[PDB]
Design an enzyme around this catalytic site. Structure first.
Site, PDB file in Angstrom:
ATOM      1  N   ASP A  26      -1.676   1.753   5.528  1.00  0.00           N
ATOM      2  CA  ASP A  26      -0.820   2.054   4.389  1.00  0.00           C
ATOM      3  C   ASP A  26      -1.338   3.317   3.721  1.00  0.00           C
ATOM      4  OD1 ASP A  26       1.214   0.906   2.215  1.00  0.00           O
ATOM      5  OD2 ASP A  26      -0.554   1.655   1.156  1.00  0.00           O
TER       6      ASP A  26
ATOM      7  N   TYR B 242      -1.829  10.731  -1.808  1.00  0.00           N
ATOM      8  CA  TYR B 242      -3.248  10.359  -1.700  1.00  0.00           C
ATOM      9  C   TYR B 242      -4.062  11.531  -1.164  1.00  0.00           C
ATOM     10  CZ  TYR B 242      -1.633   5.457  -2.089  1.00  0.00           C
ATOM     11  OH  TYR B 242      -1.026   4.282  -2.482  1.00  0.00           O
TER      12      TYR B 242
ATOM     13  N   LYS C 172       5.068   6.687   1.438  1.00  0.00           N
ATOM     14  CA  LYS C 172       5.719   6.418   0.162  1.00  0.00           C
ATOM     15  C   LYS C 172       6.304   7.665  -0.484  1.00  0.00           C
ATOM     16  CE  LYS C 172       2.259   2.814  -0.852  1.00  0.00           C
ATOM     17  NZ  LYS C 172       0.984   3.411  -0.335  1.00  0.00           N
TER      18      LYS C 172
ATOM     19  N   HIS D 163       7.865   4.577  -4.006  1.00  0.00           N
ATOM     20  CA  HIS D 163       6.549   4.232  -4.549  1.00  0.00           C
ATOM     21  C   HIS D 163       6.636   3.504  -5.896  1.00  0.00           C
ATOM     22  CE1 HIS D 163       2.070   5.657  -4.549  1.00  0.00           C
ATOM     23  NE2 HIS D 163       2.191   4.458  -5.093  1.00  0.00           N
TER      24      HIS D 163
HETATM   25  N1  LIG Z   1       2.225   0.828  -4.149  1.00  0.00           N
HETATM   26  C1  LIG Z   1       1.318   1.087  -5.117  1.00  0.00           C
HETATM   27  O1  LIG Z   1       1.680   1.366  -6.253  1.00  0.00           O
HETATM   28  C2  LIG Z   1      -0.125   0.908  -4.822  1.00  0.00           C
HETATM   29  C3  LIG Z   1      -1.057   0.806  -5.863  1.00  0.00           C
HETATM   30  C4  LIG Z   1      -2.392   0.605  -5.519  1.00  0.00           C
HETATM   31  C5  LIG Z   1      -2.747   0.502  -4.181  1.00  0.00           C
HETATM   32  N2  LIG Z   1      -1.848   0.615  -3.218  1.00  0.00           N
HETATM   33  C6  LIG Z   1      -2.254   0.465  -1.808  1.00  0.00           C
HETATM   34  O2  LIG Z   1      -2.999  -0.764  -1.607  1.00  0.00           O
HETATM   35  C7  LIG Z   1      -4.331  -0.412  -1.105  1.00  0.00           C
HETATM   36  C8  LIG Z   1      -5.428  -1.376  -1.588  1.00  0.00           C
HETATM   37  O3  LIG Z   1      -5.381  -1.533  -3.014  1.00  0.00           O
HETATM   38  P1  LIG Z   1      -6.659  -0.856  -3.740  1.00  0.00           P
HETATM   39  O4  LIG Z   1      -7.252   0.309  -2.917  1.00  0.00           O
HETATM   40  O5  LIG Z   1      -6.171  -0.283  -5.085  1.00  0.00           O
HETATM   41  O6  LIG Z   1      -7.841  -1.895  -4.143  1.00  0.00           O
HETATM   42  P2  LIG Z   1      -8.337  -3.103  -3.168  1.00  0.00           P
HETATM   43  O7  LIG Z   1      -7.893  -2.962  -1.629  1.00  0.00           O
HETATM   44  O8  LIG Z   1      -7.927  -4.405  -3.742  1.00  0.00           O
HETATM   45  O9  LIG Z   1      -9.945  -3.049  -3.246  1.00  0.00           O
HETATM   46  C9  LIG Z   1     -10.429  -1.726  -3.011  1.00  0.00           C
HETATM   47  C10 LIG Z   1     -11.881  -1.724  -3.518  1.00  0.00           C
HETATM   48  O10 LIG Z   1     -12.595  -2.845  -2.963  1.00  0.00           O
HETATM   49  C11 LIG Z   1     -13.790  -2.401  -2.293  1.00  0.00           C
HETATM   50  N3  LIG Z   1     -13.935  -3.320  -1.168  1.00  0.00           N
HETATM   51  C12 LIG Z   1     -13.186  -3.324  -0.021  1.00  0.00           C
HETATM   52  N4  LIG Z   1     -13.515  -4.337   0.722  1.00  0.00           N
HETATM   53  C13 LIG Z   1     -14.480  -5.063   0.085  1.00  0.00           C
HETATM   54  C14 LIG Z   1     -15.210  -6.225   0.380  1.00  0.00           C
HETATM   55  N5  LIG Z   1     -14.999  -6.909   1.560  1.00  0.00           N
HETATM   56  N6  LIG Z   1     -16.109  -6.665  -0.500  1.00  0.00           N
HETATM   57  C15 LIG Z   1     -16.317  -6.032  -1.637  1.00  0.00           C
HETATM   58  N7  LIG Z   1     -15.663  -4.932  -1.956  1.00  0.00           N
HETATM   59  C16 LIG Z   1     -14.754  -4.417  -1.135  1.00  0.00           C
HETATM   60  C17 LIG Z   1     -13.495  -0.932  -1.889  1.00  0.00           C
HETATM   61  O11 LIG Z   1     -14.697  -0.170  -1.899  1.00  0.00           O
HETATM   62  P3  LIG Z   1     -15.089   0.417  -0.456  1.00  0.00           P
HETATM   63  O12 LIG Z   1     -14.089   1.396   0.031  1.00  0.00           O
HETATM   64  O13 LIG Z   1     -16.470   1.199  -0.690  1.00  0.00           O
HETATM   65  O14 LIG Z   1     -15.321  -0.781   0.587  1.00  0.00           O
HETATM   66  C18 LIG Z   1     -12.647  -0.463  -3.099  1.00  0.00           C
HETATM   67  O15 LIG Z   1     -13.498  -0.101  -4.190  1.00  0.00           O
HETATM   68  C19 LIG Z   1      -4.568   1.013  -1.647  1.00  0.00           C
HETATM   69  O16 LIG Z   1      -5.629   1.696  -0.968  1.00  0.00           O
HETATM   70  C20 LIG Z   1      -3.179   1.615  -1.343  1.00  0.00           C
HETATM   71  O17 LIG Z   1      -3.008   1.861   0.065  1.00  0.00           O
HETATM   72  C21 LIG Z   1      -0.574   0.807  -3.505  1.00  0.00           C
HETATM   73 CL   LIG Z   2       5.828  12.070  -1.982  1.00  0.00          CL
END
Ligand SMILES: NC(=O)c1ccc[n+]([C@@H]2O[C@H](COP(=O)([O-])OP(=O)(O)OC[C@H]3O[C@@H](n4cnc5c(N)ncnc54)[C@H](OP(=O)(O)O)[C@@H]3O)[C@@H](O)[C@H]2O)c1
Ligand SMILES: [Cl-]
Length: 325
Positions: free
Chosen positions: A52, A57, A86, A119
């Site tokens: 994703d 980004y 997105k 998005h």
């Molecule tokens: N549509 C939207 O509006 C929207 C909004 C937000 C996000 N998104 C998408 O959803 C994806 C994921 O959401 P998110 O990045 O905001 O947060 P998340 O996936 O819930 O968690 C990301 C955080 O968790 C850490 N982490 C990952 N695996 C872990 C584990 N097994 N144990 C402990 N910590 C861990 C990562 O650090 P490390 O990298 O150092 O492991 C990072 O700091 C985004 O990257 C993006 O692609 C979309």
């Molecule tokens: Cl865009």
């Protein structure tokens, strides 16, 4: 039902989506160049088949680099990989939709994306800035037509540039606007929203299930807790007593419990990690299951409080989080 080798679930347009994917948002400032590419490659090697991403980004070229490398060496065929991109708020003018998608295809150096989503339901002022504000810091809102934007999205699928169409951060009313559009040709197959045990989206999930829309859980691990987007005061999801307790029972981490919980109820999860060990850890969620009672106890952790509230946009005509769901 779900295994490391076969874990795709059906979309309403006849396509399918791998139930886990790698998220790729990482704060440009504090992310080394190349970290994204390396992570996507490690993810693919691990067994991930869903990535994703988003042009805004700033790393879509790395995503493409990684995907193309794995295809070139024969690790995967293009048809085995599912990429979601997105359309940003500044690119909602119908005439801009296709050129915007074409930019992403050119950046990825791919012929199509598997899923392309609006998005956010909010339009901002088109231009060289993704966050348009005046000198006073007033958010420059564009008065926009979601249905007209959607029609432009439909044209992109018609042209073969994307297999599936979806949305993100849409509420029930906003979904209805599209679902009820005069002469709708392609219904949204996906809604990407914050989802995890502290915010389980019961009402929105029910609604989407009834319309054959699959929920994709963004921030499924409770976010990286960056104070710019997240209310750092709140208790961190992964420190929850029950989730950690259940972790001990299965010799899994709270993260793995949280991911298992959502996939087990048919919600797609896209945890982000650019850490070798954690990329692998997050994928190891197919060799155990949660009991009905455990699922019930986790779902009961629901706080109906969001980590990502987007309060800076609360007054936008299309702010999605005022309504109940
Ligand atoms: N549509 C939207 O509006 C929207 C909004 C937000 C996000 N998104 C998408 O959803 C994806 C994921 O959401 P998110 O990045 O905001 O947060 P998340 O996936 O819930 O968690 C990301 C955080 O968790 C850490 N982490 C990952 N695996 C872990 C584990 N097994 N144990 C402990 N910590 C861990 C990562 O650090 P490390 O990298 O150092 O492991 C990072 O700091 C985004 O990257 C993006 O692609 C979309
Ligand atoms: Cl865009």
């Amino acid at each position: 039902d779900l295994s490391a080798a076969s874990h795709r679930i059906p979309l309403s347009d006849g396509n399918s989506i791998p139930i886990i994917g790698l998220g790729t948002y990482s704060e440009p400032k504090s992310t080394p160049k190349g970290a994204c590419a390396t992570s996507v490659k490690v993810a693919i090697d691990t067994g991930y088949r869903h990535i994703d991403g988003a042009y805004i980004y700033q790393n879509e070229h790395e995503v493409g680099e990684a995907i193309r490398e794995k295809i070139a060496e024969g690790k995967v065929r293009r048809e085995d990989i599912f990429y979601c991109g997105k359309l940003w708020a500044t690119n909602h003018v119908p005439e801009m939709v296709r050129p915007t998608l074409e930019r992403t295809l050119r950046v990825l150096q791919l012929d199509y994306v598997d899923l392309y989503i609006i998005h956010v339901p909010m339009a901002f002022k088109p231009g060289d800035e993704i966050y348009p504000r005046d000198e006073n810091g007033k958010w420059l809102y564009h008065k926009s037509n979601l249905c007209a934007t959607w029609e432009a999205m439909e044209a992109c699928k018609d042209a073969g540039l994307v297999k599936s169409l979806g949305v993100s951060n849409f509420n029930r009313r906003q979904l209805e606007l599209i679902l009820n559009k005069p002469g709708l040709k392609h219904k949204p197959v996906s809604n990407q929203v914050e989802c995890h045990p502290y915010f389980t989206q019961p009402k929105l999930l029910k609604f989407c299930q009834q319309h054959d829309i699959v929920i994709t859980a963004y921030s499924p691990l409770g976010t990286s807790r960056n104070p710019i987007w997240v209310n750092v005061s709140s208790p961190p999801l992964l420190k929850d007593a029950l989730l950690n307790s259940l972790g001990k029972r299965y010799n899994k981490t709270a993260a793995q419990i949280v991911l298992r919980f959502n996939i087990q109820r048919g919600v797609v999860v896209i945890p982000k990690s650019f850490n070798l060990e954690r990329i692998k850890e997050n994928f190891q969620i197919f060799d155990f299951s949660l009991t009905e009672e455990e699922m019930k106890d986790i779902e009961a952790l629901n706080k109906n409080v969001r980590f990502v509230e987007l309060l800076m946009w609360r007054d936008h005509p299309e702010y999605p989080f005022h309504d109940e769901y």
